[PDB]
Amino acid sequence: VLSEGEWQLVLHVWAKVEADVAGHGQDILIRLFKSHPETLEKFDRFKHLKTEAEMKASEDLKKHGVTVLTALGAILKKKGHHEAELKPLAQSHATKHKIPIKYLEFISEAIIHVLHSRHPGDFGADAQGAMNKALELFRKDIAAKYKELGYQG
Ligand SMILES: [C-]#N
Structure with a gap:
């Protein structure tokens, strides 16, 4: 569960991402x-x-990079109420791309690393902890949809 203050951390760093979505995505x-x-x-x-x-x-x-960050940003902004926004993403990655859950752990680590390099004053222990938790809810929800399709990986 993220606390409301942890969601605020996520959203505060996100706004930084938003000032240069193409550079962050690259x-x-x-x-x-x-x-x-x-x-x-x-x-x-x-x-x-x-x-x-x-x-x-x-x-x-x-x-x-822009497409990926636009879709993820729309999901993070929902603060956990993202079923609608996540479903299409889940099902396509299952059916059309055949991406194992594992890949989702890899891009999570990448995003965390980049945020840290780029927004260290904003991306402390508290913010890294909340982002980690947001990305892990995102994966867990993706893995739930995969399940429903019978899509392993
Ligand atoms: C698509 N990453």
Whole structure:
């Protein structure tokens, strides 16, 4: 459960993300691809991307970073009442992308790392703890929908 004050922490850092969604999105996906290169074979769209250099210059990668952060931001802003906003995301990742839950733990770690590098004055122990809890509720809810489809992974 996040306390209301922990949701406020999440939302306060989020507003920082929002002032530069494309830069945050690039950092996050690159971080993910560098830390868990196997996840990159799950994105059809990025098969031409090899070097870090290539990732940084990619428009496909930047535009996707925006799409990912827009969808997640809409979910975080709901403070746990996100069934509507999460359902479409869950079902597509299950059916169309076949993304194991594990991948969701990887991109969570990436987001946490990036927030910390970028907004350290805002991203202390208290904020990291609340974000961790928000992302873990997000995964748990995703895993519930996967279940309903019979989608393992
Ligand atoms: C889609 N990350």
